[PDB]
Write a protein that binds this DNA or RNA. Structure first.
Ligand SMILES: Nc1ncnc2c1ncn2[C@@H]1O[C@H](COP(=O)(O)NP(=O)(O)OP(=O)(O)O)[C@@H](O)[C@H]1O
Ligand SMILES: [Mn+2]
Ligand SMILES: [Mn+2]
Ligand SMILES: [Mn+2]
Ligand code: NA
Length: 308
DNA sequence: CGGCTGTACTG
DNA sequence: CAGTAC
DNA sequence: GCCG
């Protein structure tokens, strides 16, 4: 993991990200995910271009870090960037909102609180600003999953509730909990969603709602008792017929999903949380996750092997 | 030159 | 729709 | 940014 170059790149990568240059930030993200994986630290400016994810521009930049010791572009990073990052860490506010607030003269969360116009979601994000920057211990994610499962299985004991995301990928900490809910009978998943949230809300577990769709919920919960933080909770309810693809999707990682979906498109297919399809298409049968891998000509990967 | 994943709330 | 998010 |  020879990475004294990456450190300086990530500063630039972050800068592009918060300023909304998502594609350049994407290039940097992949160039960096590479350097933290090359066996022996990079030596030659040719050793660079001989790596997947690094080209003429990135290579010559790496050659500036090694040779010179520091990259000059860093010195041209707008001074607004730290403030933009602060604002964009409010849930529900992205690059465009942060830049607008910044143009309006706002510089601190006190400025936002007192003077900014906030959406319903942003007001919740700001209230829980600190909490939402903390990742929870794996054990707390378990407790949250079980709270949801216990409350759901009370409408129907056959309902499957499974924590996906970083949890299923085996991480020691989780930014939130992602709970996928279904029923193996392909039908009992219906007419449950709204009742579930109502009971979780009734028992004081759900504290705030961010997004409420027909089959997806993004919100905020807090386990009972002292010393508890507010945690983000996302729930989706899917018909059993879509279980494997939904599980695959909601497990990720995000970068893994993107790569897998890109691959599917090259093979004349389309992959979503609903189905693996032939391009516009026929829905290919995917009873299990393994079926999706096999249809794409891929060796199966355990969730921990998908942590990209 | 131009895609870089595919989907779904909010207002 | 643009913006934000999973 | 990267790559085809
Ligand atoms: N941009 C995306 N494209 C495709 N799938 C995504 C994307 N973003 C999130 N997902 C899927 O939704 C799941 C939850 O997204 P999350 O935003 O919850 N990220 P996750 O990996 O769980 O990490 P932390 O909660 O511990 O920070 C991800 O693991 C992916 O499986
Ligand atoms: Mn998550
Ligand atoms: Mn999530
Ligand atoms: Mn709190
Ligand atoms: Na945000």
């Amino acid at each position: 993991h020879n990475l004294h170059i990456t450190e300086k790149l990530e500063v630039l990568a972050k800068a592009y990200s918060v300023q909304g240059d998502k594609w350049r930030a994407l290039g940097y993200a992949k160039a960096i995910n590479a350097l933290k994986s090359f066996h022996k630290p990079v030596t030659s400016y040719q050793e660079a271009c001989s790596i997947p994810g690094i080209g003429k521009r990135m290579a010559e930049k790496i050659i500036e870090i090694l040779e010179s010791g520091h990259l000059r572009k860093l010195d041209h990073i707008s001074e607004s960037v730290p403030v933009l990052e602060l604002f964009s860490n409010i849930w529900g506010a992205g690059t465009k909102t942060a830049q607008m607030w910044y143009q309006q003269g706002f510089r601190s969360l006190e400025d936002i609180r007192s003077q900014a116009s906030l959406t319903t979601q942003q007001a919740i994000g700001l209230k829980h600003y600190s909490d939402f920057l903390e990742r929870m211990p794996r054990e707390e994610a378990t407790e949250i999953e079980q709270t949801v499962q216990k409350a759901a299985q009370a409408f129907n004991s056959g309902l499957l509730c499974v924590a996906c995301g970083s949890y299923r990928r085996g991480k020691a900490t989780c930014g939130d909990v992602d709970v996928l809910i279904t029923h193996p009978d392909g039908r009992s998943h219906r007419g449950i969603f709204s009742r579930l949230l109502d009971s979780l809300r009734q028992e004081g577990f759900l504290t705030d709602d961010l997004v409420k769709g027909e089959t997806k919920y993004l919100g905020v919960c807090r386990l009972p008792g002292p010393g508890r933080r507010h945690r983000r909770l996302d729930i989706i309810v899917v018909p059993y017929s879509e279980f494997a693809c939904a599980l695959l999707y909601f497990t990720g990682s995000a970068h893994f999903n993107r790569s897998m979906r890109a691959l599917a498109k090259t093979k004349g297919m389309s992959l979503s949380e609903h189905a693996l399809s032939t391009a516009v298409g026929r829905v290919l049968p995917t009873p299990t996750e393994k079926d999706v891998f096999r249809l794409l000509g891929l060796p199966y990967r355990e969730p921990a092997e998908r942590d990209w």
